[PDB]
Amino acid sequence: GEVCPGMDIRNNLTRLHELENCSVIEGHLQILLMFKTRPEDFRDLSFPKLIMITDYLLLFRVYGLESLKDLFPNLTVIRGSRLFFNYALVIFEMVHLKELGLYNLMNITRGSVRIEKNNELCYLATIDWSRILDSVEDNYIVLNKDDNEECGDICPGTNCPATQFVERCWTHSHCQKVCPTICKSHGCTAEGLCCHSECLGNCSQPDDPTKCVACRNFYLDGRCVETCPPPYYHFQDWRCVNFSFCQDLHHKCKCHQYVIHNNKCIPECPSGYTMNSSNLLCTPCLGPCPKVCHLLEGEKTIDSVTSAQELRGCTVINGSLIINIRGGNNLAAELEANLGLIEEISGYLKIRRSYALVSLSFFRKLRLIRGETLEIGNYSFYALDNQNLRQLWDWSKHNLTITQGKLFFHYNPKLCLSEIHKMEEVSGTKGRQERNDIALKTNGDQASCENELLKFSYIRTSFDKILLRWEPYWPPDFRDLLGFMLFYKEAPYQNVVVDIDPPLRSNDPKSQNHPGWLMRGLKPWTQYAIFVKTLVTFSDERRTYGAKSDIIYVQTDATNPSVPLDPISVSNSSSQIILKWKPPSDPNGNITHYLVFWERQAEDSELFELDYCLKGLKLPSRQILKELEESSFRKTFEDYLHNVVFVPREEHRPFEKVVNKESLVISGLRHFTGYRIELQACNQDTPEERCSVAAYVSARTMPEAKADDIVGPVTHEIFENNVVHLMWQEPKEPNGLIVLYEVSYRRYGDEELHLCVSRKHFALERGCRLRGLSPGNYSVRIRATSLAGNGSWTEPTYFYVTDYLD
């Protein structure tokens, strides 16, 4: 009929009365809150005009409705163009809905079905969705009255195409007429004829592209096509609009203003592609993209994490920035990953009234600021009441340029006038500013703008100890020195606490009064960041701020590596042991190799002679201003006493150097032998022996099969006094060592008896000797046990033992 957009329905059905006049819906359809509704609002209501819906269908809380076979008879296409948590069909909390009733459903190409909490719902098990959907594996159909099976889903075919193999029916008066024949996913008509290959489901005339019920892929000018020809673009993967309708959607959203890529009129370009206004095209950026974002009325006042995270992705901004964040949890890494993407600001930047920030180095790559939108008084950088900000940027790295406007620095008390002059020299704002734009006494009144650089005199190293010394530094009234602070942190790169006792001056002809500190508990092979600052008293005249040292990068030494972690071992083969480990916690430089030593172990000598024919036969299974004030109190006592006293008138194991592997197969071993294993690591082997101390494990291979299986003959003896002596061939290689022998023996008609033969019973009787036998035809069978287990039987050896009667 005619094209409507998507709409959302609440309360009433006057929205259903302007859903009467529509046929084609370009959007999504939601049903929520039909609290008022009756059966007599829904037995006089029918919409057969509707055929197509793009995005999704949502249902919530309908009273009084029973079915949709007399409400929605002709709905086929569920496209799923906007995929919505991969669920294109959601239905939640239907009371009184006994059936689904969408008997002309042939199409879900893209999307899945969520059914939940509809307590009156039968007619689900006679719907084959595999003819409809391309994949039914993601469909979430749960919590119905069909799921607790009492539902009388009766068919017309009790006629219906049966696809369990049950007869398939949507309603009681219509069948599952989705065509499984040679007409295929395009579908057949009611006469059984095939439709066109750009038709979908049904066709109003058979094999017609002009007269499909539903198009398969695309739609242009009363006909179903497979792709758009030029100048028409692929509009939302269902129809063909062109430059005029895509440009009227562009100037209607002048809203995701509609762009051209891959002959499609898509809403926004993807991440390799950028907007250029001259051609209206997704130009191929594929990397460092000029992302230009237009603001809402020239400003965005930003004050939290969630208000900060709107601009994550935007680089160039068309407007001004107002920043007012005063607190948070563990800042500037996520604020650096946010606000280090900014290149150019067209408006001003106003840092007003912030507290908790300590640097502006979360702003990473800011090079050019326009400042076209200004503050009244022509200000582009407005710093106001910003408390704890110690640095602006690092000026070995950063360059910044202000195009237009002036500066404003009022009440920013922890930042220096050399950084204000570095802003006025680097930023191009030397002659722009008027009188008292910079409030001079409010900024840098309480800081450390120290006017001297310390020099590191003497430096030593160890693996865990750095012996630092530097110069003697004093203030010129040197009772104000409290000593030094030095901060340490771990330094993996160059990408940037001990209180120190003061030294003793007295006098100096040549006096070594170099102070310093030995730091004791260091991690080996670790580059560190050490700098030394001074702690003076804020005096009553023009201030000596003190001095600070250079940051240095001093690395600790290696010496011995540590124990490499966790020796564990699983036996793969009988000659192969994989040894696996982890690297140590102190690697101590670039490690050359891992050094392993393996020793074959001899057996236990107690267990040659343990008779386990005796019972007990078990085998093992094998804050600062207090003490700033308090030291100036002893200065001013001493000034008072001076102003009233003084007045004018080898075991070589087999071993291997494991180069660039964290595992080693240990080959060349015997079957089922205990082993002794030394594991070490070594970062320096050829210029002398800096290998580590040993890691200790023991291991054992998996056993063989036929090492425990008995090879050799079964040979009896017949003596004079009815005594049977049996010898055999022992396996000379068992799995590890042999322990015990067992004889199962049974006469011709009798039962099987047992006998325990030990190794001392073998070695005393050269085999085994049997006495006291009933006369008959015995058969003897011998199993044997080792340290591993029970290797299997011998043959039945038939022998007639003597009777001495006949």
């Binding site: 030593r460 160890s462 100890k465 012996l467 030995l518 004791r520």
Partner: peptide, 16 residues
């Protein structure tokens, strides 16, 4: 807080 032979090697390393 060194204590033990770490103080003995700290007196070995203090005045080299």
């Amino acid at each position: 807080h060194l204590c033990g032979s770490e103080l003995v090697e700290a007196l070995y390393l203090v005045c080299l």
